[PDB]
Amino acid sequence: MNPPPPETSNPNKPKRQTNQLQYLLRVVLKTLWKHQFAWPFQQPVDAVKLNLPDYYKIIKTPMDMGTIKKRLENNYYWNAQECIQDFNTMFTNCYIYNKPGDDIVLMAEALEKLFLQKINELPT
Ligand SMILES: Cc1ccc(S(=O)(=O)Nc2ccc3c(c2)N(C2CC2)C(C)(C)C(=O)N3C)cc1
């Protein structure tokens, strides 16, 4: 009941190594990675392990920091806005499937605020 995770490599996609993309890996992702609340987001949702077979009935564009990290390490992105957009998908997924109040949402909201704070200023 687990779909194939998002791709982390795609030879036919044009890639760039921009300064902002390096920053997103170095500074932004690797900071969020170490947060107390990062652990549920460090790998795809395992609907089987969690016995939540309804998760992928609801969430149709899955994303996680582990996938984003692998995309960054593999230079998958063209620009930073593309990466940021995957971050936003991850957070939105969590808010979609869960409800205000839920502990997983407090974690997501907390990570998000750190995330927004970190990307408020990107390198030139
Ligand atoms: C506070 C907390 C409670 C349970 C767990 S977990 O061990 O079960 N592992 C786990 C990892 C990621 C998620 C979830 C569980 N849930 C929430 C129902 C929990 C869903 C599927 C919705 C989610 O969107 N994400 C992002 C971790 C933290």
Q: Crossing angle, helix 103-119 and helix 80-97, to 10 degrees? A: 160
- Tell me if 65 sits within 8 A of 80, measured CB to CB: no
Q: How was this structure determined?
A: X-ray
Domain boundaries, the chain: 18-122
Give, as one character, the DSSP assignment of residue 79.
S
Mutate to test the pocket of ligand 1, among 49, 50, 59 (most ligand atoms within 8 A of CB): 50
Resolution (A): 2.0
Would the CB of 76 count as within 6 Å of ligand 1? no
- Tell me if 1 sits within 8 A of 53, measured CB to CB: yes
- Two tokens at 104? 């997983």
* CATH of the domain spanning 18-122, picked from 1.20.920.10, 3.40.390.10, 3.30.465.10, 3.20.20.30: 1.20.920.10
Report the distance separating Cα 104 and Cα 74, nearest Å. Answer: 28
Own/partner contacts of 40-46, CB < 8 Å, gap of 24 or more, are 40/104, 40/107, 41/65, 41/66, 41/90, 41/94, 41/107, 41/108, 41/111, 42/66, 44/2, 44/5, 44/6, 46/2
